[PDB]
Every structure is written in C-alpha cells, then in structure tokens.
RNA sequence: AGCCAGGAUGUUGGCUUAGAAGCAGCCAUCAUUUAAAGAAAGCGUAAUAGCUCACUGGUCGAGUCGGCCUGCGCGGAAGA
C-alpha cells in the first residue's frame, strides 16, 4: 500500500472520494484499494 | 437542488415562524430553537418550505441544500426523533445505559463510565440494546459513534457494538 | 427407444466429437437417405406425414452441429 | 438522481469434470412471449447465498452529461 500518482483501475463497490482538490482510493470490501494521490 | 425546493411538510406538534433572517422553530420534543441564515435564503408558506442563496456565487449550491436538510431533520427530530435501536450480541456483552452516563460490558479493564455531552439522554430496557433519546440527528449519531472508538471491533472477530445493522468486515485466517 | 436426432446424426456422419482442430479433425457429410432415416423419429409428434417437413427439423440440428448437407 | 415492479421462456442448448448454483475448457449465436428482460457483461465462495449489468414500465419533472483542446491555479515535492 502507497499514496500511487495514476488511477487507472477500480471496482463498482470503489466509492473514490476528493479531499482538497485531491482524489482518493477508497472500498468498503477491499481494505487493499488505497491511494490518495492525483 | 430540486430537493432544497422540495416541500417539507411541516407535521404535528411542531410550529415555524419566518422573517428575512433567522427561522424560529418550536416542537413537542424539543426546545425553542433559532438558526441563523448567514449565507442561505428560506421561505415558508404557512405548512411548507424552500431554501436557495441570498445572492449568487456561483452555481448557487454549496450550503442551501445542507441547510435544508438540517431543516428536513429537525421538524422530525423536535416530535418524534430519529431510530433508537445500537445492538448488542457478542458473548458477556451487558448494556448498563443511564440518564446522561454510559455503562457498558465490552472487554475492557473500565466498563466505559462516560459521561456525555449536552441535548443527549440514554436507556437500555433490555441488557442487548441501547436506547437513545434526542431531537438532534447530529449529536444522537456522534455519540454512537465515538462510542464505536471504544474497543474497536477486531479484524478476525469483529465483536463489538452495531446499529441494527451488522457491516463489520471480519477477515477469515489464511487458507487452508 | 430410439435415441435424440444429435446423437442419430452422430453415428451417421464422420464426425467423431465436436469440430475439433481446423483442417486436423473432421466432420464428414451426410446424404438425403441418411437426413430421411433420422426424421423418423419426429413421425409420432409431427401431425403431418409429409417427410420434407419432418426432414427440416434434422436439416436445421446439422447446422446447429456444423454437419453436412452434401450428396 | 431517488422510490419501485418484472432480469422470464425454448433450455439440463450439446460434449465434460466437481457442484454448475449466470461466474470452467470448446462447439452451436439462434429463437419467443411483450410494454419488456443477452444462449447476459461482472463481482462473490472450494461450492452457496448475496451484490450487480441489460431492457421496459410506474411517480415527480426541466434541463443534464462524458470526452478532446486551450489561459491560469491544484497536488506530485526528500537534505544537510
């Protein structure tokens, strides 16, 4: 697990959220889907 | 926002008065509430609502909507509140809740001994479920959710406090 | 009893699967005679006694099955 | 967008293992009822249940959306 500068993949439980102007990675069944860059 | 514009339907035992700043609300479950509208704009027409804001900037949504929905909660919450069911099933587990303290049975060397914020009052009737009363939907979810902070439900068990609804995401050990 | 038309066409035909591997496994062909003694078996469920369309059915599960039509 | 009814049928298409339960190789990609639902994308477990497309339809009802360029900011960013 890292901060990751690319989207690039997800899935449709992924709800993805921005946070001062920034996008993160976020799923409530894959505690592996983190990345709070972009 | 169709929804900021959207009606509201003020129900019984609650009643609103207007004026082009502040909204005043009485109702049966709460007290004599005022809010201030520093950065929206709200109508009522005797029994119904809309909000929007006092001048443009731009798209003109950013707090109207939030403030109605503020509002679409309290004339609900100052007469018949919001769900009062946080559940209890793991094993030892014992509800303790009283007035403004929370006692509780959840595997920790203290059995809570909280004493709560303000506008908040708990029960338990029964030793699986605590019941909480409040006319404010904020504070009656903050509270159960700061309580969740408490022992947090483990990765592999995942035992601890739930609202009714079980959402804990209890890992199985490596296979096997 | 008499089995279903796939299988009745299948011990007719030169086909031992299946397609199987282009230019490699085989299929074979089967003739009008040969098409005439499968439709047989639509004879009691098809009112009409005319073999063309009782043949229709067999000329329809070879294409559903890539076997051949050829004299 | 939300709330909500249907995601059906020929059919266990056929070969096959282990269940096949849409979610397993390779072969057939056609048909039907209708206002409307693919021989259906996908997840889910060893299997299931569950989640979830597709298409039509019920209610409010006026605007709404995804890319491809360009001026300018946003983070990307760690050193004595």
New binding site residues.
Partial sequence: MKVR?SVKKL???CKIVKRD??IRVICSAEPKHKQR?? | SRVAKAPVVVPAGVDVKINGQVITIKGKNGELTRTLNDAVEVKHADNTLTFGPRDGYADGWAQAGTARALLNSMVIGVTEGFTKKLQLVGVGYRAAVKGNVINLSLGFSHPVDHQLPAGITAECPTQTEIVLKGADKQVIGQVAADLRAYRRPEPYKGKGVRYADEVVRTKEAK?K | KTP?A?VLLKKAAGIK????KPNKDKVGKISRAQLQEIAQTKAADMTGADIEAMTRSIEGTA????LVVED
């Fill in positions: 500068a899935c449709r439980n102007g920034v860059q972009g | 296979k | 279903p796939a699967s299946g397609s199987g294409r559903s099955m890539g």
